[PDB]
């Protein structure tokens, strides 16, 4: 995701 | 019956008052204490809900009572969760908990524009900032370049939180000042979850360690490494020289 801190 | 309810939230900030008859945090002096058990936004409040909070210190208790002192000036607050596209009813009404934390100034980072710093020393776990911005989607956010996704967090499998140009400028936008803390693979901060009482579910910044007064604060952006990285540049390059120093 190109977000911050997204839970993998 | 005549006694005081305290929720807590796990953030550690918390909504106190006398409870409605139907259980409900319900009245005119109702108050959020933010996580320092010391700042509070006291006044109206519906169903936990704030209508009208104005700026007080928490002084005391006494027998689980707060006791409060408003604040100078006419400081006033309101429930004002963002929308897809607007960020904020106030704009550049600065959080008064994290006004007196950190502040914006040039990064010690190369190349890496403004930074967010700490105004004053704390503890470890200490909240530091507050991550708010527009709602969006996964959707929105993943099928666009990433030129339009330097701002963005993701909140949770829903909804991602952005702060789009020209709200990244602090002159446009202050009231909240998460979105300025630059990357780290050595972070000394993290994100964690955050119920506020006027941007509704976000994210904060949270200290791991101790932190002085004027360090930057910078937290591990998160990009998937392994989908090379889906990431921009800089951060791929950063990437690769720190699993060399490993
Ligand atoms: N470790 C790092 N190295 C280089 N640039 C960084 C960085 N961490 C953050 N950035 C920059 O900061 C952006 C994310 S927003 C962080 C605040 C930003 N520096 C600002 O001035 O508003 C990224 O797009 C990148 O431009
Ligand atoms: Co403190
Ligand atoms: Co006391
Ligand atoms: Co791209
Ligand atoms: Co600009
Ligand atoms: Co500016
Ligand atoms: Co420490
Ligand atoms: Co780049």
Redesign the pocket.
């Given at each position: 995701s190109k977000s911050k801190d997204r839970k993998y | 019956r005549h006694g005081v309810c305290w929720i807590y939230y796990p953030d550690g900030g918390s909504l106190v008052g006398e409870v409605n008859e139907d259980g409900e945090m319900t009245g005119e002096k109702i108050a959020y204490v933010y996580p320092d058990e010391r700042t509070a936004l006291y006044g109206k409040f519906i169903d936990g809900e704030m209508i009208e909070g104005k700026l007080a210190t928490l002084m005391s208790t006494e027998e689980g009572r707060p006791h409060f002192e408003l604040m100078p000036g006419n400081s006033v607050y309101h429930f004002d969760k963002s929308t897809s596209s607007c960020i904020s009813t106030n704009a550049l009404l600065p959080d008064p908990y994290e006004s007196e934390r950190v502040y914006v100034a040039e990064?010690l980072?190369?190349?890496?524009?403004?930074?967010?710093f700490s105004k004053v020393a704390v503890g470890p776990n200490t909240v530091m900032s507050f991550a708010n911005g527009v709602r969006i989607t996964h959707q929105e956010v993943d099928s666009r370049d990433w030129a339009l996704n330097?701002?963005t967090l993701s909140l949770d499998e829903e909804t991602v939180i952005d702060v789009p140009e020209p709200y990244?400028h602090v002159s446009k936008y202050c009231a909240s000042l998460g979105?300025?803390?630059?990357?780290?693979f050595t972070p000394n901060c993290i994100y964690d979850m955050f119920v506020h009482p006027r941007f509704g579910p976000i994210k904060c910044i949270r200290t791991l360690r101790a932190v002085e007064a004027d360090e930057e604060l910078?937290v591990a952006?998160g990009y998937d490494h392994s989908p090379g990285p889906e990431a921009?540049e800089?951060?791929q390059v950063?990437l690769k020289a720190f699993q060399a120093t490993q």
């Open positions: - | 990064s980072i190369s190349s890496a524009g403004e930074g967010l330097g701002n990244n979105h300025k803390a630059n990357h780290s910078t952006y921009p800089w951060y950063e």
